[PDB]
């Protein structure tokens, strides 16, 4: 190897174009059928401890 | 009815009521002037050869002024030749009063 190196400074425009994919997708959340609080689906509700209609966990 | 006149080495189509910018004329503001006619048209049509004898266009001079500054710049690379010159072209403003056919 012979130590490759950038030929030109990346423009503000080109830098920012590269970052057109870097945006975050907001978390996917559904209401908990017991306490109405929002939570990730398929996860035991951290607010009331309910999953599949029953208490699973102390919160 | 329009007319084609010739002032300051250039030609323009004029109708009464029109305001016009031409090259500077040696005439006090407010005075009126007669411009040479190359062609009359609209109702009748007369073709100057090159000018039309009896016809003239009477214009009142509204004033004289200087055009907005243009920057004419000269640059020659690898030589340190650079020139900056500011140019405002003189002009006179006319109001076309009548077309004497």
């Amino acid at each position: 190897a012979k130590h490759p190196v950038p030929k030109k400074k990346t423009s503000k425009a080109r830098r920012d174009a590269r970052r057109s994919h870097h945006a975050l997708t907001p978390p996917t959340l559904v209401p908990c059928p017991e306490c109405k609080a929002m939570k990730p689906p398929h996860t035991v509700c951290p607010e009331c401890g309910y999953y599949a209609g029953r208490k699973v966990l102390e919160v | 009815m329009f007319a084609i006149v010739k002032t300051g080495g250039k030609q323009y189509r004029v109708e009464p009521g029109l305001k016009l910018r031409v090259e500077k004329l040696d005439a006090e503001p407010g005075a009126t002037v007669e411009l040479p006619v190359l062609l009359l048209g609209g109702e009748k049509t007369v073709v100057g050869t090159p000018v039309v004898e009896g016809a003239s266009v009477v214009a009142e001079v509204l004033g004289h002024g200087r055009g907005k500054k243009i920057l004419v710049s000269k640059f020659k690379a690898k030589v340190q030749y650079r020139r900056k010159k500011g140019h405002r072209q003189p002009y006179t403003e006319l109001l076309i009063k009548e077309i004497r056919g």
Partner: protein
């Protein structure tokens, strides 16, 4: 006494940078780049001032030519006829006539044919 740069240089740079507004990237933001662009733009203007006078005449000639061929003759014939007729109405006006006042242009075409 001492006369340090002080205020003078910033001011000279701002003159340039204001003149370079609108340009792309560092050309409107960096003094040095602004200057290099402004040099080119000065020569371009001067050159294009001179060539604008050409750009229009060629349009005028194309338009005059279009109206001439409607009456069965070409531009090169039309101009010669006008010269022989002694008509000195310019191409800026001939073109305006060709479009705005077609019957007036027709008459000129007539005198052009009559001249030869």
């Amino acid at each position: 006494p001492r006369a340090k740069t002080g205020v003078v240089r910033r001011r000279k740079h701002k003159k340039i940078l204001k003149l370079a507004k609108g340009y792309w990237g560092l050309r409107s933001k960096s003094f040095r780049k602004a200057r290099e662009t402004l040099f080119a733009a000065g020569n371009y203007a001067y050159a294009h001032r001179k060539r604008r006078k050409r750009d229009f005449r060629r349009l005028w000639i194309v338009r005059i030519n279009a109206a001439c061929r409607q009456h069965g003759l070409n531009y090169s014939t039309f101009i010669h006829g006008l010269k022989k007729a002694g008509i000195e109405v310019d191409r800026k006006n001939l073109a305006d006539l060709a479009v705005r006042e077609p019957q007036v242009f027709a008459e000129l075409v007539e005198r052009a044919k009559a001249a030869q």
